[PDB]
Design a protein around this ligand. Structure first.
Ligand SMILES: Nc1ncnc2c1ncn2[C@@H]1O[C@H](CSCC[C@H](N)C(=O)O)[C@@H](O)[C@H]1O
Lengths: 229, 6
């Protein structure tokens, strides 16, 4: 028995139940910002404002700027990120999420600007293929812990094929201090920085930027953003 | 989303 675990196969007893329990968990969550953020709705603006600053460097600076035609919000829920981060920056946004009721609520939550959400894909990321040469930005936030290592590596590889020229993938998510930790309540994992780095490398992706989110509640996991292509 | 550390 090792000092700690470092991959999902060490903490997930039954992959089918890992996914089915997670789907059941999200079906029971209110379709609200505080539901998306597990009781942390009060820090949504802190999150979004840092994400905007992080992303704007790729859209506004450099000789090979990331485009603003189309973004994909992965694990989008009701569209908290689509509303305040993506729709103001991209002409069109697509959303993908496993929970249909969140995509339904999105149509109300997003309001008039939600008319620029094109596709509402109801699908688990582990079964989702983003269209080749389709997105300038693929935003993956607070959902990677719901995929096994093999599914996450393969999903990221499919995302890479989906990027337009100069496009990027952004992962923004919880990072454990060490190892891989199972949350048996929502049926998710939290991985350390080295594990995530290994998975990113295995998908064929290169790291463009890495940033720890400042100003978050003291008691929560650290949150990191990775820009990849 | 955000989660209290284990
Ligand atoms: N396997 C999976 N594939 C796609 N979405 C999943 C998933 N497992 C959980 N989800 C979705 O992941 C989201 C996590 S809550 C975070 C929502 C959004 N990224 C935000 O930051 O506001 C929920 O909307 C839930 O339905």
């Amino acid at each position: 028995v090792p000092r700690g675990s470092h991959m999902t196969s060490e903490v997930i007893e039954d992959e089918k139940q890992f996914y089915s329990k997670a789907k059941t968990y999200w079906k029971q969550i209110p379709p609200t910002v505080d539901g998306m953020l597990g009781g942390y709705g009060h820090i949504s603006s802190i999150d979004i404002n840092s994400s905007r600053k992080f992303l704007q460097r790729f859209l506004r600076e450099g000789p090979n700027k990331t485009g603003t035609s189309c973004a994909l919000d992965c694990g989008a829920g009701i569209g908290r990120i689509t509303k305040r981060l993506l729709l103001p920056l991209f002409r069109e946004v697509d959303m993908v999420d496993i929970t249909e009721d969140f995509l339904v609520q999105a149509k109300t939550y997003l309001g008039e600007e939600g008319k620029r959400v094109r596709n509402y894909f109801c699908c688990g990321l582990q079964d989702f293929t983003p269209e080749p040469d389709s997105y300038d930005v693929i935003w993956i936030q607070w959902v990677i812990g719901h995929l096994t290592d093999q599914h996450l590596a393969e999903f990221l590889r499919r995302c890479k094929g989906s990027l337009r020229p100069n496009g990027i993938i952004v992962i923004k998510d919880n990072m454990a201090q060490e190892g891989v930790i199972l949350d048996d309540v929502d049926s998710s994992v939290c991985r350390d920085l080295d594990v995530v780095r290994r998975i990113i490398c295995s998908a064929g992706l290169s790291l463009l930027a890495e940033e720890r989110q400042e100003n978050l509640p003291d008691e929560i996991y650290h949150v990191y953003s990775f820009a990849l292509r | 989303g955000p989660r209290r550390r284990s």
